[PDB]
Amino acid sequence: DSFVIRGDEVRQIAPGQTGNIADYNYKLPDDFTGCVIAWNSNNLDSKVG
Amino acid sequence: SALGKLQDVVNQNAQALNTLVKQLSSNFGAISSVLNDILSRLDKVEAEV
C-alpha cells in the first residue's frame, strides 16, 4: 500500500492504531504482519503556494 | 466434637470453594481484578496485556 502524509502523522501507521488517519482514512489490521516504510518527501511533493 | 472425620470433609470443601471464589478479587499484578475496569479504561493493545 502507499499514500502521502504530513510529517506529524507517522505514529498512526502501526498495528491496530486509532486516530483520524487510522479510523477515517486507512486502517491496519490489529494482527498486521508486514513492514511500514516511510520518508520525508518535501523535495518530491511540496510546491510554492 | 465427636463427628470430626465427617465435619472436616465438609469444612475442607467449604474452605477450598471459598478460597477459589475469593481469588477472583485478587489482582495478580494486573491494574484491577474487576474485568469491566480494563474493558472500559484501556485500548485493546493494553487491555490484552
Curated annotation (Swiss-Prot), chain A:
Effect seen on changing R11S: In strain: Omicron/BA.2, Omicron/BA.2.12.1, Omicron/BA.2.75, Omicron/BA.4, Omicron/BA.5, Omicron/BQ.1.1, Omicron/XBB.1.5, Omicron/EG.5.1
Domain of life: Viruses
Recorded consequence of changing K47T: In strain: Omicron/BQ.1.1
Region (Integrin-binding motif): 6-8
Effect the entry attributes to changing G49S: In strain: Omicron/BA.1, Omicron/BA.2.75, Omicron/XBB.1.5, Omicron/EG.5.1
Chain's role: Attaches the virion to the cell membrane by interacting with host receptor, initiating the infection. The major receptor is host ACE2. When S2/S2' has been cleaved, binding to the receptor triggers direct fusion at the cell membrane. When S2/S2' has not been cleaved, binding to the receptor results in internalization of the virus by endocytosis using host TFRC and GRM2 and leading to fusion of the virion membrane with the host endosomal membrane. Alternatively, may use NRP1/NRP2 and integrin as entry receptors.
Quaternary state and interactors: Binds to host ACE2. RBD also interacts with the N-linked glycan on 'Asn-90' of ACE2. Cleavage of S generates a polybasic C-terminal sequence on S1 that binds to host Neuropilin-1 (NRP1) and Neuropilin-2 (NRP2) receptors. Interacts with host integrin alpha-5/beta-1 (ITGA5:ITGB1) and with ACE2 in complex with integrin alpha-5/beta-1 (ITGA5:ITGB1). May interact via cytoplasmic c-terminus with M protein. May interact (via N-terminus) with host bilirubin and biliverdin, thereby preventing antibody binding to the SARS-CoV-2 spike NTD via an allosteric mechanism.
Descriptive protein name: Spike protein S1
Species assigned in the record: Severe acute respiratory syndrome coronavirus 2 (2019-nCoV)
Span of the entire protein shown here: 398 to 446 of 1273
